[PDB]
């Protein structure tokens, strides 16, 4: 996506939780995923 790498699904949850979750590692993280960008 625009913010966010090709791993990712930005879901801000009905509790107040935007989990930036990677689909290649299946990791739910609140840490900046764009950090992984060098993956390309």
């Amino acid at each position: 996506q625009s913010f966010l790498p090709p791993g990712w699904e930005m879901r801000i949850a009905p509790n107040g939780r935007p989990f930036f979750y990677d689909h290649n590692t299946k990791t739910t993280t609140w840490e900046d995923p764009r950090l992984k960008f060098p993956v390309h």
Binding site: E9, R11, A13, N15, R17, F19, Y21, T28, T29, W30
Partner: peptide
């Protein structure tokens, strides 16, 4: 859905 809603519990 199959969207990431599973909050990591620390």
């Amino acid at each position: 859905a199959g969207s990431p809603n599973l909050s990591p519990n620390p």
